[PDB]
Design a protein around this ligand. Structure first.
Ligand code: UPX
Ligand code: UPX
Lengths: 285, 285
């Protein structure tokens, strides 16, 4: 049975989805009679909730409520469009315009995370939720289970002293430290590749090369026929995100300044979708 | 003034030492009238205490009491010999025999840490305490302020899934992961070098090469005249600990099996010092 304090506030309904350690249910908030989603995580979820309670961005999910019972229950706003995964599965692909709208929002979300010292580390189509069943909708990033808070590092503390007794490998790691966030830009690149083409850049399908070797050489699977209808600009961005050196890789800022995203129609549609979502209280002047 | 709960149990006395964020005082336990040391740390000290409360080895300091007040107060057994630092400062050097006794204990201490999933990360002569003012004494490792508990890593969790969306640098790091403990073997190597020779292997004294370059090339400063009186075996061990590749570096096990430590007289003296320290309760048979 559901925990009493959850049943007290919400009437639980049908299943909307079902992940590995969890499941998502439709619920009705008793006070308002409005629909919510409730994510169940079976037994640092509590610290995932505190990360998410701090963040305030339209393209990142918000926690409405939380119950820590036999299992964890996370209440959030309904995302009726479901997962992005379902739009790209089975070689389905989105219009290039729709890819741009979605991707712009993802970049804004992840930029906001990185500005706020948070790395997601598990960006995938499964973790991108769509607001509605309409093509032109808002998206939100979810599932912060693998996320990490950037702070003062062990390395930074060590380098304040004299390294008389310090191991060489620690000194060598200074070259590449502080680029953990680049893992999210790589994932975005892979997500963009999938959205534009309907297939994954790295995959064991009809190849001899190991997945690991595909990834570390950066040699994505390019099938000209699938890509011919896609613009050069969109593929150019993909290529700047799938750079194997994390220091040369495009950051979210660099991506947002890329020609592919200098598209005032797309941006207008995003802004229009935002005000439509919003319900403010009346302003002076 | 000292906190009331500390004054309740102990009478505070003279200063024995004074580190950067702290100071060490002589105290008398009221109940027993026996001497203790009290380390003051001015404001994860509390988790350093919990690490130390779990460990049980004769060459690692034990916490007798702890007070978290305006400052932190850590009560421990008196180590009347003081810091090892003071035995090696000003180009002073220990007899080779004394170096072996001390170093054997350090290896046993650090082996015990690594077997128990703890890396110290700040092994230095300042953090080695001596039991008595006699040459042949027990030593204890102290100051676990930079220590880290080894556990299930982010990497291990990532590698359980398929790396479709995983950045190449994460896959590359698999080659060298799980060798963090080797930093302690390097420090031990530096400590041994200093003990045997009376001077530091890496240092900015009369050289053009930067400290960092000295360390990452592993090119220690070898002065033949200082070393001529030291055995080949002792220097051979030093060289196997000051290896720049952390995977080729000697572990504490490898060091303990080194010819330099196959010395039954040294080991006899260690065992004799242990039973002397100990006060058991009577045994059946
Ligand atoms: C925060 C979180 N997971 N965190 C963790 N932490 C460790 C494992 N999961 C979520 C994971 C998935 C979530 N999914 C949904 O809200 C959702 C999925 C879904 C599928 C179809 C339809 C809807 N819907 O709201 O209409 C849907 N909503 C929401 C939250
Ligand atoms: C646990 C710890 N420090 N932890 C942390 N954590 C962040 C910064 N320090 C210690 C650091 C140093 C300690 N030093 C001593 O007990 C000590 C130093 C010293 C010097 C001369 C004589 C004695 N003595 O006990 O007779 C001495 N005892 C003891 C504990």
């Amino acid at each position: 049975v559901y925990p009493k304090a959850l049943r007290d506030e919400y009437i639980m309904s049908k299943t909307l989805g079902s992940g590995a350690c969890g499941e998502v249910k439709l619920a009705f908030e008793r006070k308002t009679c409005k629909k919510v989603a409730i994510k169940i995580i079976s037994k640092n979820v509590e610290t995932e909730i505190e990360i998410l309670k701090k963040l305030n961005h339209p393209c990142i999910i918000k926690i409405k409520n939380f119950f820590d019972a036999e299992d964890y229950y996370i209440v959030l706003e309904l995302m009726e469009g479901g997962e992005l995964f379902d739009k790209v599965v089975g070689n389905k692909r989105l219009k290039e315009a729709t890819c741009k709208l979605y991707f712009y929002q993802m970049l804004l979300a992840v930029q906001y995370l990185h500005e706020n010292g948070i790395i997601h580390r598990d960006l995938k189509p499964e973790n991108v939720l769509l607001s509605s069943q309409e093509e032109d909708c808002l998206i939100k990033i979810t599932d912060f289970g693998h996320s990490k808070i950037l702070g003062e590092t062990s390395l930074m503390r060590t380098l304040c002293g004299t390294p008389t007794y310090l191991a060489p490998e620690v000194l060598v790691s200074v070259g590449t430290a502080g680029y953990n966030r680049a893992v999210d830009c790589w994932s975005l690149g892979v997500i963009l590749f999938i959205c534009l083409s309907g297939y994954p850049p790295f995959s064991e399908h009809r190849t001899q090369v190991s997945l690991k070797d595909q990834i570390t050489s950066g040699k994505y699977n390019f099938i000209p026929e699938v890509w011919a209808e896609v613009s050069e600009k969109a593929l150019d961005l993909v290529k700047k995100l799938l750079v194997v050196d994390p220091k040369a890789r495009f950051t979210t800022e660099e991506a947002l300044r890329h020609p592919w995203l200098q598209d005032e129609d797309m941006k207008r549609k995003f802004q229009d979708l935002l005000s439509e979502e919003n319900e403010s209280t009346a302003l002076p002047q």
